[PDB]
């Protein structure tokens, strides 16, 4: 019988302006208050590779495992993804610029419980 | 002494078999903690404050802080049980789970030592923060001065400790413990739940019992100095009587 | 050399241990922790790079012509380094009011030994063990 | 060096032993309360059911 | 005086090393706050009220308001700790987290200042609003006048502040602080949790200790004037002893 | 056993009538009470460019990063999006008119916790 | 009237670095604190078979029923799956490397009640 | 303001190893604690016919209504379904093997309130 209103998530985003021609945005779940993230949107100002990494350290990134998820070309948005990472699992997402020049990257999603 | 064991099932008229009490030791090796200060006679005259008394207080405090570092470093590094919270149920549940790990090894803890971040999260726990869940509003009101904080999960003492007191190995002359003291990131140890009768702080002084403060004058340089000394070790007698809480 | 504690900046105590506290006259304005050499008769000025110019570190800030105290050899001292130093690195004056490694300098021997490692622009702890003057 | 305790630890004094020996783990004793206890007159016996 | 440190682990017969009390200062310079009013002779006579007594009261009030502005601007701008609520858990948990920040730098705060918007949010907090979770209905019924609102998170004092008191730089001849005072939007500072003894209102006056009121006649124009002055600065002795709550 | 009725979290909308030939609807998460927004729908009375911006300032838009998400042409509805923005991440959504005249724009979605 | 904020799930992930040419990653629901898992993302550094197994033992894998769900070629991401397994049903998910060389495998999802 | 973590409600599974050439796995909502089930996944080690049945008896399947939902060919996975069954509405799901030999069947999803 009890009626309750549900606000449907806690917001997350990482962004960088003018990241160089081989540099990267590191989406680190340590920056989330709940320790885990689910990235839905990647808006890219040029071509990018998305890479999912595990660290061999609990806190810093030292590559244990790495997989390139997809390559996006041109300027645009990918939306409705569920790219998942957390601190206790030591998971990081790296968006790497592959344009011949600087680009803007804006990734968004929601926090998830650890 | 060795743990308690179990008697054996035996025939009738049969030889009783032996399993005698078996012994070992834990060794203390008290480390000299020292703190010096020097003042020019011209500084000491001109200053409005008594700088020597003030440096005597610094030396006293600095030695005391050293006792606290040795204690906390031993306590955190050498606890034989751990509770992994994995970023979840941090609060009373983590505390009860830590008592759980000690209780599994057949010791009763009575004391807990807490980091500022752990204290913060603990007083955010709805179990303590809501007066109906806690049975009192003392945490909501008086925070750490609440008598319930000194009386959680069968424990009867809370020892609030500072973030700087664990040996990170960043401070000069200190080599660093194995753990990270904190409650901020994955793997940090933010609380220790233990029996206070099973961890020993061993104090040695050659000229009494407590800290010794000595002064000297240099008539060649017009410098007056103050030195403090104390010898301390900390050792567990039963490291299993203790559990760390891990973020 | 200076120490931050919140909003407060505190002056670094240059001397850790030692009794080689020798007195001179300042040939220029000198700052606490600055390496110095003999510029005239019992007169000391700021050390230049690449050796041959070291008697000690200046213990407190002074104007030109004022009496100055040096920590000499056989002092443990807190000194600002211009580069990254590890324990056991030999260091000597960089000429910039700060110390650098013998490995970085054109010189083949140092004046102090690093006891505590530090990053560029930070306070290391060093033990002074030698003097450098004019060999030609 | 000049006379120091770490060179004469078993030469000029013995290391202290604390006179309090310190207990191992003690197990929980409950069975006498947690059960009906029969003080038997014989080693072997029967209860009727 | 510098923070107390830790003694060094030292060898037997080794030299005791120096780390004495190091010192610095906090400067004050008291800004002259002034308020003026002029009344014509004809108006002074004809009014039903004592216009000069009115204007003296106004001038004293305007100076008292100036003191509060200098205090709030220092307090908000120069707090070294911060708790970012990020639009969430604003209320008791935010206050507790602010006390957590001050505790982590090893001061105990005892007081908090609050914006009207923060007060609004705080009394909407289910932890205080629900008598169940609060332990009394005092907040639900008496609001800010409730004894708990001056006894939360270990704090002994609530300093209820006004919306307009902080220096926005929108007031005439006031230049502005660095922050925003409010609780409405990202980056608004809505509360400061602090040690009352570690922030100093500093008052200077040439002719006494407090506000100086001077009257003057203008026999050329038939005006009487009233002027008030005080010099005030506000400074933290330890800015780490305070934390701002951020929206 | 306890049974709760779930109602969806607060509605959000931004709108403009007669936005000129190169002007824009600046959708700002500051206008939401929970501080973050998820735009599902963009109804556009003519052709538009959608742009996602991060500000260098906490409360006004001073462009740090800018990515054009998509170009919509004609009059119609884009729906089922998860275009995500929040005040604390300093994220703004801009819809720019590219028609040869004035148009109407209505964006709708829901609030997310900041 | 009462308004609540919903933070989703509890995060679950299994990972392996350099799993050998014919070896496998065994995703075990016993590693989840709620005892059941729903895998959404499988990231694979080369070609893999996904296999769903029931065990005949309560705690270890002793194969009863086995089904190969699908084979993924190349390097990439599979997202929006719902492969489900739990402890008291003794269900297991095996990712088998088929690439002929060493690969990295990352599975992510969320915990579910037993 | 009150913030809550949502973990998804109970996992459900039925499975059979070596079901014969014309035999079936019968998924019965009586086996769920909440009394009702939603089947997302059907994993089949060979071809199967899926059939949805209503019983004339509250506790045993005595067929009243039957619909063949679909036929799946070869080995594989069907995922993202919402096949729905309840004990109080007396609905059952039958997966029938139609391969020329024995197969393994695993079905999964979640419990729903009856
Ligand atoms: K020498
Ligand atoms: Mg980690
Ligand atoms: Mg961990
Ligand atoms: Mg034995
Ligand atoms: Mg154990
Ligand atoms: Mg009180
Ligand atoms: Mg010496
Ligand atoms: Mg018998
Ligand atoms: Mg120091
Ligand atoms: Mg701080
Ligand atoms: Mg009243
Ligand atoms: Mg903010
Ligand atoms: Mg903002
Ligand atoms: Mg099992
Ligand atoms: Mg079982
Ligand atoms: Mg039925």
Residue numbers in the entry:
A (entry chain As), F (entry chain Ax), G (entry chain At), H (entry chain Au): 2 to 115
B (entry chain AC), E (entry chain AD): 150 to 396
C (entry chain AO): 2 to 137
D (entry chain AB): 101 to 149
Authors' own words:
The capsid forms a right-handed (dextro) icosahedron of a triangulation number T = 7 [h = 2, k = 1; (42, 43)], made up of 60 copies of the seven-protein asymmetric repeating unit. However, the handedness of HFTV1’s capsid is unusual, as most resolved structures of both tailed and untailed T = 7 icosahedral capsids display left-handed (levo) symmetry. The base layer of the capsid consists of gp19, the MCP. The MCP forms alternating pentamers and hexamers, which interact through asymmetric trimers. In each trimer, the MCPs adopt three distinct conformations. Lacking the first 100 amino acids, HFTV1 MCP fits the classical HK97 fold. The interior-facing surfaces of the MCP are highly negatively charged, which has been suggested to prevent the packaged DNA from sticking to the capsid, thus facilitating rapid release upon infection. The trimeric MCP interfaces are bound by trimers of gp18, the capsid stabilization protein (CSP). HFTV1 CSP binds the outer surface of each MCP trimer, thus stabilizing the capsid architecture. Each subunit in the MCP hexamer contains two intermolecular Mg2+ ions, as well as coordinating two additional Mg2+ ions in each subunit-subunit interface.
